[PDB]
């Protein structure tokens, strides 16, 4: 039981860190094209899917 | 001044530009910006465009370059002379542009910047420029013709 | 020169001066002096006077401003022109002074330093200045008007 | 430029010479070299010769003073005036030399470095210089009169 | 003609010359000699000196350049102009010669070949050349400044 719980917590931490890292990197890659272009349409849907 | 040289060991290793309140410099160019006001700005990385960006001091915002995406075919101006825009590609005569000229801006006849020169292709009689520009929707895009090398 | 502007981010936000062999800079002005010889000396705090001081380098001790405690009523000058000294107050016409003029010394008709300006108050007709001066006994005193603002 | 001054506190306290494609600077002269590229290169110590040396930058390899070991009796020159060589000793007129002249090379009638000056002695009629020169075998030899003061 | 260009794909990769009765060309030069009488000769690989050599055909024996080991300091001639030789070093002004010029001979005031150019080093305002020369006893040697790039 000790080994199982420790393994589950380690898996949860690694997976949550990877998921958050991928989502934040996605936001950076999606939004950067528009930060360098202040005069852009910036559709509202962009702020809903990539944020 | 609209263009600021970047010095590594006392020699110019590139140029930084300020457009619409934001400063851009080549990500692959190492060294300090030869400007106390710009050298104090902490810039964010944008690996998609091989450049770093950030905001400029309030004193400079009033005189930054104007962004534009209207890029009809024809000739454009840049530091070393005129630039030809054809087939959605920027090209210049052979011998115009090289190592250390990365980051220079390309402007139309209205003084608006259309692309940032990061590199190019050395052909027999002409050269093709690897530049960062905006599409018809005003979204930043990087154009890197096959064989382009950073300057 | 004898007055050395103090620069923070490549912009002047005050002025340092050398009086009687000592380098005086305002305490509320943060930044580095635009020099290499005077900027390498460690400065002591004088928070009671909103001043900092240090020893002038041996090669610079001779090229310093003289000061006097005798301040007869009349007109004095500084970087921005004439300054009126009456009713125990230093004052300049409205709008002549402003933020950034911190540490600029005031000179008499003989070229001697009489006060170091740290701030001021805008009155109905003239702006009163908050300065560090020496009383009739030559003792350093902080003479500030009511509601003075640091510059 | 082939001879560069050395600065410690903003004033010149000696010289660093580019002779033979190598930097020659006295050891008793502390400070940075006027040229930024010559100051950026690591130098080796030769205590037996009271001088410090190192390889010059690529661009300075050709732009260097040539040296000669032949110094027959006659006259030579340096930035303080003419230099007279007699009895195998370098003697300058009374009072010509002094503090800060160390590191300056003595040039012949062809512009070649004959010796590097390090100090001197006032004999009451003429001044003898402490120099670093080359013997009849072309080997570096230090020649200093007894009691010579490092300059 | 006593010098023959070497071309691989129609571009000049180097030059060959007839000195003393032998045909000389560098190892690093690829392509065929335009003169079929020389190109058909089997050349020995003298990797010690980066030179290929062979026997001049009897029909070409008259097209032979005289050589000498007597090379005092002074100026020498070659296809790009004058060449300065001093301190056992061959030097040309920067920009005089480059890739493709290897194998050219250097001639004295009597038209005798004193060296064959293999490459060079750009030393500021001057470029040092890597050359194959004969020592004071007439023995073939290879002189290579550090960092020399084959031409």
From Swiss-Prot, chain A:
What topology does it adopt in the membrane?
Single-pass type I membrane protein
Lipid positions (S-palmitoyl cysteine):
30, 50-51
State the name under which the record lists this protein: Spike glycoprotein E2
- Which pairs of Cys residues are joined through disulfide bonds in the record? 30-51
Localization of this protein: Virion membrane; Host cell membrane
Membrane-spanning ranges: 1-15
Query: Which span of the entire protein is present here?
Result: 686 to 736 of 1239
Q: How does it assemble?
A: Interacts with spike glycoprotein E1. Processing of the precursor of protein E3/E2 into E2 and E3 results in a heterodimer of the spike glycoproteins E2 and E1. Spike at virion surface are constituted of a trimer of E2-E1 heterodimers. Interacts with 6K protein. E2-E1 heterodimers interact with host VLDLR or LRP8/APOER2 to mediate viral entry. Interacts (via E2-A) with host VLDLR (via class A repeats); this interaction mediates viral entry into host cell. Interacts with host LRP8/APOER2 (via class A repeats); this interaction mediates viral entry into host cell.
Q: Post-translation: what modifications?
A: Palmitoylated via thioester bonds. These palmitoylations may induce disruption of the C-terminus transmembrane. This would result in the reorientation of E2 C-terminus from lumenal to cytoplasmic side.
Region described as Transient transmembrane before p62-6K protein processing? 29-49
The record describes the protein's role as:
Plays a role in viral attachment to target host cell, by binding to the cell receptors VLDLR or LRP8/APOER2. Synthesized as a p62 precursor which is processed by furin at the cell membrane just before virion budding, giving rise to E2-E1 heterodimer. The p62-E1 heterodimer is stable, whereas E2-E1 is unstable and dissociate at low pH. p62 is processed at the last step, presumably to avoid E1 fusion activation before its final export to cell surface.
The residues on the Cytoplasmic side of the membrane are 28-51
């Amino acid at each position: 039981t000790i080994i199982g719980l420790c393994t589950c917590v380690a898996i949860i931490m690694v997976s949550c860190v990877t998921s958050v890292w991928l989502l934040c990197r996605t936001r950076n890659l999606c939004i950067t094209p528009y930060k360098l272009a202040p005069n852009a349409q910036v559709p509202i849907l962009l702020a809903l899917l990539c944020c | 001044d609209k263009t600021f040289p970047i010095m590594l060991n006392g020699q110019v290793n590139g140029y930084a530009c300020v457009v619409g309140g934001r400063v851009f410099k080549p990500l692959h160019v190492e060294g300090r910006i030869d400007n106390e006001q710009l050298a104090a700005i902490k810039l964010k990385k944008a690996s998609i465009y091989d450049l770093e960006y950030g905001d400029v001091p309030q004193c400079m915002k009033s005189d930054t370059l104007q962004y534009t995406s209207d890029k009809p075919p024809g000739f454009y101006n840049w530091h070393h002379g005129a630039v030809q825009y054809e087939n959605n590609r920027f090209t210049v005569p052979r011998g115009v542009g090289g190592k250390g000229d990365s980051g220079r801006p390309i402007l139309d006849n209205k003084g608006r910047v259309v692309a940032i020169v990061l590199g190019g292709v050395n052909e027999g009689s002409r050269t093709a420029l690897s530049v960062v520009t905006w599409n018809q929707k005003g979204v930043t895009v990087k154009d890197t013709p096959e064989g382009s090398e950073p300057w």
